[PDB]
Every structure is written in C-alpha cells, then in structure tokens.
Subunit: 376 residues, 5 copies
C-alpha cells in the first residue's frame, strides 16, 4: 500500500503534480517495460518504411497508414476502460472492507468472559486465538504474501497461530474443501461451553459474542468469494483486446509519412510521436490500474499489507483479552467536573480552526411581524 494522504491533505499549488516524482507504486514502474517494447516496435517500423521499402512499397505503406488513421477511435476504448476500471476499483474497496478486524469481538471477549485466574485467561485467549486463526486461514488462502509466510499448517503451528492439538483436530476433520470455517464452529462450541460453565454470566452476552464472530465469518466468506469468483475472463479479454488493438493500429497509423508528399496531418515530421506516447501513457496506465487492483492480495506496491494486519490483529487481540481484562485506569472526576460548558483549549497552530456552530440553513431567514403571525 502506497500512502500519500498526508501529501494531499490540502489543495496546494500543484498538489497532484508533486506526486509525479514518485517511483514506488507509480505509473512509470508499471508500464516502462510495455512502453520500451512499443517504442522498439514503432522505431523498427519507421526504419523499415524509411530505408527498406522501395518507392511503390513506400506508396503502399503510406496508403495503409492513411487507412489505419480512420479506425483509431478514443470513445469506445475510453468507455470500455472507464466501466471496467470502475468495476475493478469497486471490487478492490469491497475486498478491503471484508478484511476481518477482531476489535469488536476482542472488546466483547475482554468484557464478558469473566475470571482473572488461569482458566479465565486461557478461555479468553483461546476464543480470540480462534478468531485470529480463522482470519489467517482465509488470508493464506487468498493472499500470496501470507501464503509465502505460512506455506503449510505446520508453519501456522510453528508461528503459534495454531496449537499442535488444533492441528491434529483439523487433520481429523479434513474434507475436500478449504477448512477456514472450522475455527468459527470451534468458537461457537467453546463459547457455549463457557456459558454453561458460568464464565459467561448471561445468554444475552453469549448472543453478542456469537453475532460478532458471525460478522467476521461473513467477512471471511466474502474474501473467499472474491478470490474464487474472478471478474469474468471475457470482460478482461475484451478490455485487453481493445487497448492492444488500439496501440497495434497506432504502430502503423501514427507513423510520420514523408513530408515531401504533403498528406493531410503529415505536413510536419517529428521523430517522436508525442501525442501517441501520451495516449499510450494514459490508456495503458488506465489498464494498469485494473491490472494492479484486480487481485489486491498479491505483492504489488499498492496491494494490501496483509502480513502487517495479521501481526497487528494477533498482538492487539491478545493484549485486549489478556492484560486489559478488568484492568481499567483509576476513575476520577475529569477537568470539566463542575463546568456546564467545557471548552478545550486551542494551540497557536490550530487557533484559526475555532468556528462558530452551524445552526441550520434557515437560521438567517428574516421575516416581518405580520409574516410570523399564526392564522386561524
């Protein structure tokens, strides 16, 4: 993930222009190879036309180049690229929204599951570990970085996501499908056992724990669905064919003919087709947005940092359910204990952001005495 939120906080002078000096997760990094191949092909065709072809062959090539210009339309390529990239970006954000975070669940497990003894600690840690294990199982199923980190369930055991007993149970339960759903059934059964054992005081609390767990299950299922149900290959092939056909036509149609024969639009002979290269940049970059975002769990620069999320979730969830259980700061009266209207101070840097309240769009309407009188 390339984060530039801080750089674009304000709409300053050339805010977006300063982002063109970035290499990591940039357009240049994405399309330099394709641009070099296109450049080599274009200049090979140019040299063949200018040196190898005879006069009659040169005239035939010039007619072919003039005929190619009529089939280069930007409206269809722009429309198909716009729709396809919009779908890819929508799916990309939906995929991010389905990354499971244990924060709601870990707050409920910290609160509800009682006991500061070893058994209560073990129960809370086991429940939150089941949540983390389900998340890491689906992530190593869908993310290449996580898979490279945990290429086998034995790696999960060595890393401490799974105990050897849990590994044995998963091997025993093995079916010919992905087994990422198992820790959620384990969580439900352990929560029920905790409630029957008196560690969860009320069934309303048990229902709340299960609702959080089921929300995480739904998120994991969505991740699996996005990994499995790709954007239809016909749509991807259509957009690829559109872009590549456009630039294969541009290889011949955008060749600078002899300025001696003053063909319309060929009176000036540049050596570098600036507009063709700009169009290459725009359209191939638009396609590379989709290329990078179509699977956001790969190892691209702008792909999700799944390994960081896995580590953070484990650390934070274990701290929440183990050391922060019934460990609250001393409850004392605050700064505004007898202040009816608290007014926190502003720093010198932030004094200009002190604003009067917005009281509604109708606040400043002025009416006469006659206009405000109720009628019978």
């Amino acid at each position: 993930t390339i984060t530039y939120t801080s750089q674009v906080a304000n709409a300053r002078l050339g805010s977006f222009s300063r982002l063109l000096l970035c290499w990591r997760g940039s357009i240049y990094k994405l399309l330099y190879g394709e641009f070099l191949i296109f450049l080599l092909c274009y200049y090979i065709i140019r040299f063949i036309y200018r040196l190898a072809l005879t006069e009659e062959q040169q005239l035939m090539f010039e007619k072919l180049t003039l005929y190619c210009d009529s089939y280069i339309q930007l409206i269809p390529i722009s429309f198909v690229l716009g729709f396809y990239v919009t779908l890819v970006v929508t799916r990309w954000w939906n995929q991010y929204e389905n990354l499971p975070w244990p924060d709601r669940l870990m707050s409920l497990v910290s609160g509800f599951v009682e006991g500061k003894d070893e058994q209560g600690r073990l129960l809370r840690r086991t429940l939150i570990r089941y949540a983390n294990l389900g998340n890491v199982l689906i992530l190593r199923s869908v993310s290449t970085a996580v898979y490279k980190r945990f290429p086998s369930a034995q790696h999960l055991v060595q890393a401490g996501f799974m105990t050897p007993a849990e590994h044995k149970q998963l091997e025993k339960l093995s079916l010919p499908h992905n087994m990422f759903w198992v820790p959620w059934v384990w969580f439900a059964n352990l929560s029920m056992k905790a409630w029957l054992g008196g560690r969860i005081r009320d069934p309303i609390l048990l229902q709340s724990l299960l609702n959080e767990m089921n929300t995480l299950r739904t998120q994991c299922g969505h991740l699996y669905a996005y990994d499995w149900i790709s954007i239809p290959l016909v749509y991807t092939q259509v957009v690829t064919v559109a872009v590549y056909s456009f630039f294969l036509t541009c290889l011949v149609g955008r060749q600078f003919l002899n300025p001696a024969k003053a063909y319309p639009g060929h009176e000036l002979d540049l050596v570098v087709p600036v507009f063709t290269f700009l169009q290459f940049f725009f359209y191939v970059g638009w396609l590379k947005v989709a290329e990078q975002l179509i699977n956001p769990f790969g190892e691209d620069d702008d792909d999700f940092e799944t390994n960081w999320i896995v580590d953070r979730n484990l650390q934070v969830s274990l701290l929440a359910v183990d050391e922060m259980h019934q460990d609250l700061p001393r409850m004392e009266p605050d700064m505004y204990w007898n202040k009816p209207e608290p007014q926190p101070p502003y720093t010198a840097a932030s004094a200009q952001f002190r604003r009067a309240s917005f009281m509604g769009s109708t606040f400043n309407i002025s009416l006469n005495k006659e206009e405000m009188e109720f009628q019978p």
Copy 2:
C-alpha cells in the same frame, strides 16, 4: 467459474495479455460461431460483388458501400453496450451475494442445540438438513445444472436431501406455487419444539437461530426474484439490435472496392478486413459478457458452480452440527502465554513483507515549540 486470480496477483509485464491464450470461458469460445457466420457472409458478398455483378451493378454496390461506411458511426453501440453491461454485471454480483451459505446457522446449531445422544444428533442434523433442503429447492428452481441433477423431488429423496416423510408432507401441503419456503416453516416449528423440549436452553438462543434462518430465507427469496424479474426484454432487444445492425452494415460498408476506381480510402485491397474483425471481437465480446452473465446459473464456463456449492454445504453443515458438536481441541496455553508482544516469524520468502505500522497521516507533521502551546 473460471478463476484466474492467481495469474493476475501482480501487475507483471503483459499480465492481461497472457490471459488471451485461454480457451475455457474466453471470448473466442463465446463468439467463434458468430465470427464464422460473419466471415462466411462477408466473403460471400465480396465474391458476389467481384464475380457476379455487371458494371452498373458494381457502381451501385460501390455507392452503397461508401454510403454504409460513411454513416456507420450513427449506431450508438458503445453507449448502449456500456450502460447495459454495467447493469448486467451489477446484477450478476448481486445474484452471487444471495447464494445461501449455512455457515453462521451451522455454527449456531452446533453450539446451541444440546445433547450428544441420538436425539440431539437427529435434532441438529434435521435442522441443518432443513436449511440445506430450502437452499437446494430454490437452486433447482433457478439453476439449470441443479435441475439436471435433481429433475424431480424423488431425485431429492434418492440423493438424501429429503426424507420420504418430508416428501409426503410436501405433497400434502402442495399449492399452485413454488414450495421452496416450506423448509423454513419446518425449521421454525422444529426449533420451537426443541426449545420447549429443553434442547435449546434459552429463548435468546432460539431468536439467534431463527434470525440466521430468516437471513437464508431472504437470500433464497432474492434468488427467486432475480430468476423471475428478468432485465427488461426491451433493453436487451435494443442492445442486440444495435450490435447486429452495426455488423450487418459492416458486411457491405467494409467491402474492399475495386482499387481501379480509386475511391478515397479504397485504394488498397487487403482482402482480410483486420480492423473490422478486431471491432467484431471487441463489440460482440462486450455483448457476450452480458449474454453469459445475464443468467449466471446456466452451464456457461463463467457461470456459478451451484452443484459444487450444494455438495459442499451439505458435507460441511452435517460435519459441523454432528461430529464437531462439543468436540473441541485440547485447550492449552499458546506459545505467547507470557509474551507481552508476540512476533510470529517470517520465512525467507516473506521477509520483505515485514512492514512498520501505519500510525496515521498526521504522524510526521512537524511543529515549532511556540506552535504547540495552548492559548487562553
């Protein structure tokens, strides 16, 4: 479903270009028949014009070709295709999102319904089987593959989805409507009976079971609605006529006229209209995206694997509620039992994915000592 998520994990050199060498669920497989018909017609009209028309007839045909070529831009094919295909793809993903998964319900039935005896096993299996029966009834109503697998309720009985008693009860209840809603009423009544019999310990647990079941009912109803309420036929007819009229005009307008007559743009006879064929691939493939996705429960390569989903749901749900009920792995301290900050290891392959935490876009803002002083 053709899955190519693994192939497009990273935006490598020509990432989308390598997908053009795929046959299953590809553009070529979708439109090779239409392309062969178009090619045959194009070369029939070419041979009629060149070998079976007189001079005056040839001149008339050349005028008709110039008129077709000059006015083919009047067909708004890209606009109608874009807006239609976007709607089709939206409905396709919505249809997938309404495929019922019993995973939340199966976890709740595994937890809540108590009893390791025969009566408990039968009760849990019966509830999860009612969920699976409802799902398979709606799927065989809307999916051609599932219908071919279960062309009658007796096939459901032979396949073990439906008990002979359940078949008799469905025949007894028969109304002049689709009976996919019956297993949900059966589930509600059996859950109430289980709660009254003490197998479900608290009514809060019964409410949770029914809320999950009702979610599945809503998903099944959405599937039925999508099957019934098609995309309006007028919209489909409009888009079809746009594409077919474009490529029927192309039959005449894209003919290579006699180079002797020296018509503007017809000086070169290439025999093969390469750009017309590229346009055919692009526009007919764009239509074939909608053609394949308009009913995602058919037998296309990119259609949903409904039979696999049916089999997996049955296997997983029965395992979850029968063998995994109160069958938990041994609960022992994990490897980070007294580690305040766990740090799972990284492999050699994944060492480069270890990242520092994102602490917010404001983390690196630098302020002077005077700028950070509170003002009165």
Copy 3:
C-alpha cells in the same frame, strides 16, 4: 413481467438474437405507433420537397438540410438518455426490493404463537391477516391492477382481506391520509395481547415478531414514497425534449437531397433512411425503456404482477400459520446418518458439472526448501 431467464441460461449461438422474435413486452410493441407517425411525417416532407417546392425553394430547402446536418450530434442525447435510464432502472429494482413478502413473519408466527385450539388458530390467522391487509392496502394505493381488483374497501371485505369489524374500525379511525399504517398498529396491539395471554411464551419472541412486522412496514413506506416522490418532472421533460428535438431535426436534416447537385453526403438517394430509422429504434427505444419502467406497478407487459403476489402471499401465509403449525414430518435418521463424507449422486445429464473444490488462489504457489524455513 416477461420472463426469459430460461432462454438466456447459456451464451449459445445468437442467444440474444432469438429474443428479437418476441412481441409481448417487446420494443416493437412499445414504439410502432411513434415510428409510424415519424415515418408519415418524414415521407410527407420528402414529397413536399420533391413536388411542391420550386427550384429556388428547393435550393433553400437543400441549404436548410445541410445546416441541420451539423446539429444532429448523438453525443448529448446518449449522455442524457444513459444517466436518466440508469436512474429509472435503479428505482425500478429498488421498487421491486420493497415488495413485502410475509415469509419471515409467517415462519415466526407459525413457530412462536402457541395453541392448536380454536383461539390459537384464530390468533395466528388474525396476525398474518393483518400483515396481508397492510400489504394489500399499500398495493391498491400504488398499483393500478390491484386497484382495479379492489376499487373500494368494501371490495376488500368481499374478497376476505378485511372483516366487516375491521372495516368498521378503519372507518372509525379515518384521518385525511392514506390509512395503510393501521394494520401494523393492530398487529403490535394483538401481539402484546397474545404475550400477556400466555400464547407467546417469551418477550424475546414478541420482539422478533415485531421486528419482522416493522421490516414489512418499512417496505410498505418505501413503496408509498416511490409512488409519491416521482422522478423530478424537469428531468423527464429535459430527456423527452432532447429525444424529440433530435428526431424533429432528423425530419429535415436526414432528407435525401437531389444527387444531381452532388452535395457531400447526399450522393446516394436511398428512399428509406436506414441509419435514421436505426437511430430512431435505438434512442426512442431507450426512452421507452424508461417510459415503461418509470411506474412498474401499471399494466405494461414488463410491469410487476402485483395481483399474483397478493394471492400467493395470502395462500402461503394462511397455510403456514394455520395448517403447518406444529405439523412437522417424522424426524428420522437421514441417508448419511453414519457417512462421514456424504456424496450425493449426479445424473447422466449433470455428471459434467462435478468439480473439485477451489482451495484458494495461493494453493499452487511452489516454494523451495530454502524459501520455506522461518528466519529468526
């Protein structure tokens, strides 16, 4: 509703082309009258230009046609039509999604409201009848077909939706507004009475019943809102003016001028303006899609079958709460009672749809032994 889901299950050879031979809910049925008027006007103008106008008047008419030709640009009409039709189609599907189905509520009333005696039957039937009465009240408010079926509350009484006592109570409560909200208050009061009378065993069950009823109330309110708050008339007038101005300009601008004068673009005098008629088909059909979908509760072929929904809901809901209450099929061990991995059979027709499970996109990543050891 014209349903063609079965016809478009697979992307076969000319799948969408076979739908062009449909008359009911087709484009031809929608625009034949407008097409005939446009054709009659076009050919009257053509005959006036060819016969009535003198030489100087013919030259003026030809200048007018050339001047009109520059202003028949399709880029604006496609933009307004696409955005407007997208809004109409979105509202159309949202309107369908707000059709109330009592299936969740009917399952909860069948389960929760106890009693196989006359009083329990009467209570369950009365609750589900209140739900159906609310639905039919809003539908006859918004749907012309339902109104024609029930043009008065006495028709609802004769049809058995409403008892004479309920009719008297509605007359007694009458306010100067639509009274579709009344049965929901009746349902809440009757549910509370049932819970106080011991027919509903727990307040958790009562809360579940009320949540389902309130969901149906929200759906009915959305239906009322869509019926009341039309798409702004200015937007509809704008899109209508765009299309009609385009095809009124086409009456003069798309006249075939005398080919003798060799005007640019008028060299060939086809009698029938094939491209103008295709443009008419596309743009007026796109507008007719909106015209038919703008109120989906009328009597168009593609409008919703509200009367069928009313009848089905009543039949199903009454059967669910009356005959199917505590009427469960015999609960016996299933076909896979001691089968750890059930495998339902495939028919000969469906054997090709058996697939191996998708195990995740990272399953087939290969790593070396050196890549797979954890680093400290």
Copy 4:
C-alpha cells in the same frame, strides 16, 4: 412535490410527450427568466451588427462569429452536467430516505407502554410527542417552509409541539449548538422511568423502543449533515461556469451573418435560432434539475412537502398511541376459515391480471429418461 406517477403508469403512445403540457414544476417555469434574458441579449447583439456596425466593424464581427462558433464545441457541457446532476439526484433521494417517520416507533409505543388510565395515556402521548418534537426541530433547522411555519420555539409552543415546561427546559439546557438532539435524551430517560415504574413490562421491550428512537435520531443527524455539508462549491461553480460560458459564446457564435457573404453555415438567414434555443432548453433545464434538487427542503414545486409530513406524523402518531392502544377490531374467523386454498375474487376490470404462478426458470426443461438416471 409534483406527482405524475398515475399519468406514466403505462407506456402509452407519447406517454412522456403529454408531460410537456405541465406548468407546475416544469422546465418552462424554471428557465423562462433566463431564456428571456438570453433572447433579449441575442436580438440586441443582432441589431447592433445589422444597424450600428460599419462595414469593417461588420467584417470584424463576422470573423468573431466564425471563431466563437468553431470553439463552442470545446466546452464539455454534457459530461460535467451528467456527473454533477447524477450526484445531486443521488443526494436528493438520500435526503428523502432520511425524513423521519414515527410509524415503527408509534406501533411499539402503542403496544409496549401499558395502561388505559390517564397516566398511561400521558406517558404514551409524551413519548411520541418527544419523537415528533425532535423531528420538527431538525426540520425547522433544515427546511425553509417549516421555518416559515415555526420561526421561533415560542411558535412551537403555540402550535402544541412543545409544552411550556419543555420550552423552559430547552432554554435551561441551551448550548451554542443546534439543540435538535435534546428530545432523544428526554425520550430515553422517560422510557427508563416508564420501565422502572412498571409501565414497560420487560427490558427487551425497552431495548426495542430505544432502537427505534435511535434509528430516528440517525435519520435526523443525516438530515443535519446534508444541510451542513453542501456539495463542494468548487464543483457547482465549475458546472455553472461551463453552462453560462457555453450560452454566452452562443450569443455571438450563433448569430445569422449577412447571407450575401455566403460564409458556410450562414448563407441562409433565419431570424430565430431554433437549434440554439433547443440546446438552451436542454442544457439549462439539465442544470435547473440540479438547481431545484440541490436543496430539496426549499419552496420549489418539486421540493419535499415537509409541512404536510409534520402534520401527518403528529396526527397519526397521537392517534396510534392514544386512541388505538389495546383497541382492536373483534377477532373472528375469516372468510377462508376452513378453505385450504383461498382464492380472492377478481373484478371484471382486473380479470385479465389473473396469472399462473412462476415456478422457476428450470420448470420447462425437458430431459430424456436416460438423462435422469443417477450414476454411481
């Protein structure tokens, strides 16, 4: 709100054309002033060229007219108008969806809060009045019509929305912000007092009341947010400048020059620029859609009827919680008491709408006897 749903129920002959004969909430009413100003400016420019300008001045004006007409196309009025109006219409419907309706809350207050004595009546009326008071406070904050009806809190007291005691309490609580949130805290505290006093029998019922009230609070907060967070002024200024620049250029570029000079496009003199006026109608009406819909709580014809909603909500809510509490119609066996398959009658007008049930898209699939055998 202009409702034309009844007029557009069916796709009749020129359904949308008959809406061009509407004045209230029409395009004509919205842009007649701007059209008159544009007409006055255009003909005044024409007169100055035809009468005040000398020969060399006329030639300079003709060059300017040829120049402006060529680059009027450079303004992409259609794309920016389409996107901006789509955003405005989206926000308009979202704003409507956040108009609070107390129907779910009023059903729960009617059911749950017990007591047919004076204290129960007073408690129910007070709770529903707090809901209505919150709604009217936010509406008079955001709606000009409601503000004109209630220009002060004393007007709310005179109109009976607020008791003098409630007014005194609001004055006592006054903070430098909008106080629309106060009645929700009052509702929560009064509900808690009712539950502690035995008027609400169970805390599950109290939770249901508070969930409904909080939904209304969220809707009111969304209304406040839409009133406060306008569409960014830069976007509105961009679209305004695009449209106005287009039609200021058209003042000069669409002038009918001297026919004698025969400049291409100006060789024929028509005093009325029909196509420029049609373009004015289209583009300025497209902008006027956004102009009217940008604040849907003003006093436009197509703006929301907030005063009607306020009156209806108060009447209906008070009737539901006061007169309709435990006042149910006599519960008697219905018309279909012993009818297994009820079939409500159809009128003569509605007999054609009787349809057979849709049984699924797979219903009519035909298979051979061999195709329906299960294989081992």
Copy 5:
C-alpha cells in the same frame, strides 16, 4: 466546510450564477496560482514566437502549432476526469458518513446507567469520555487540524480528553501500532463492572450500550482505513498527467499565429485566448475538486470541521449524561389532549404550504359499475 444551502434553497433566477461571486472555497482561490503560471508561460511563448524568432523559425513554430492544435483532441480528459472525480466524491461522502457522533450512545448512557449520586455521575461521565477519547484519538491520527490542536497525548491530558491515570495506562499498554482501539476495551470493561455493580439493571441494557459503542468503533476503523488506503497512486498520476499534458500542449497549439499567413483557423487574432482560459478553468477546476476532496480532513475551506465536531461532541455528550440524566420536563397533558384530529396552525408566511394528503397514484382511477363487479 463552506455552506451555501440557504443560498440555493429555491431554483430562483440564476441561483447558481450568484455563487460565482464567492471567494472562500471557490475555483478562483483553488487555481489562481496555476492560472498565473499558465498565463506567464503562454505570453512568454507568444513573445518568443512574434519577436526574437527568425522567418524559418516562425514557419517551424507555425507548423508545430498547427500539429498541436490538430492532435490535442486525442487526449482523453473528460472520461478519466469524470470517473476519477466520481470515485473521489463517493469516498469523500463515505468518509463523512464515518465521522463518529455519540448521540445514540449518549442517550443510552443517560438512560441506562443509574444513580444521581457522585458515583453514578462519575461512571456516566467516564463512559461517555471513553467514547469521546476514542473519537479524538482516531481524528488526531487522520486529521491535520486536530493533530495541530493535539500534537501529543500530553496535549490531550491538558485539554481534559484524558486523565493522567488514563495517560499512564496508555503508556503502559504501548504497542508499535496506533492505540485508538484502547478506549473501546476500556468502555467494555467499565460497562461490565457497572452491570456487575448494579448500576446497569439488566444485561439487555448492557448489550445495547456495547452495540452502540461497537458501531462507533466500526466508524473509527473506517476512518483509519480511508486515511491509510489512499486512492491508488497510479490512477491519480494518470489523471494528473492527462490534465497537465493537455494544458502543456495548449501552451503551443493555442497560440495566435501571424494573421498575414491566413492559416485555416487563425484568421482572427485575439491577444487573450478566451476559449483556452475557459477550458483551463473548467478542467483544472474539475481536477481541483479531486485535489481538495481526496483528503477531506486537511485544512482546505471545503474540508470537514473536525475541531468543531470534537468540541461539540464533548459538550453535548457530557451534558446529556451528567445534567440531563433523569432530569425530565413536567409531564402534563398537551394542547391536543382531547382533540381527535390535531391541526397545528400555519403562519401567514407558510399558509401556501398547506397541502392535501397524497392518497396514492390509483386514487383518481374511474371505473364503470360493470367494471367493479366481482366475477365468479
């Protein structure tokens, strides 16, 4: 945030035109710097071309200008800008929808947590302060204005958001991640302690408190996600390059050449390019919409007022849970105590907004006596 809702309440004569005389959050303020740089470059190129350039160099420059002006339209600028700005605006409103408001939570804490003594006051204030502390932690993580106000946790302690005990506890719990999640775990533990201590009377009330808090946690997580996961840098770079390439081409292609040469399109020389400047305003303003809205938590004029929200939330939440707990206005019969149909009065200014109720689109449908008869 610039609010102009009051200015655009009605679609008056040139309502959007009057907004062009705004400076704060305007197009002028956003792009005056870029416009001055573009002006300086354009007039430097003009002076280089007209003077200090030889005849042959002038001819070369004229050929370059004709080439650039002819091929400038090849840049796709409308399509990419439309799609990108739509994505930015969608994300901007989603970011606003995730700003946490404690109004639901504050009502529940005011109602449920009992006790008018010091301990109850302290418990309520502490819970609502935990909610506010979580909100301000995430906001200072994502908002530059809030960070400038609270550049350290010690500033939060001095401002009264955090007690020194809470600061010590946060320092003790420190992990290498953002610690905005801590107050939610504190809230859950303190709520559980309150329920065990009898301050919360029922576990259903505790579940309602935790559901509200978890909703606020989800909103904070969404804010963090939007701050972290920027719009892909490749997409931003593509759009920036499109706009800047367009106007760098316009620097040369939109030069007014020597009128002596009488180029087709340069016959009129105006020193100021009005159309190029209009295009600059339109396209660069469209980009500045995205530039300002890409991070809505900066210090732009149209950015969110996060400091105001922080102050208001603290003032309102503390007042709601401390001074307004069980402090209700006197419950007395209202103005309509025995009025079956209340009718609040209208003022003279608002008398025209009194409307009859909309009774449904089918209300005015007329039928014959024969059409209304039920058929057998």
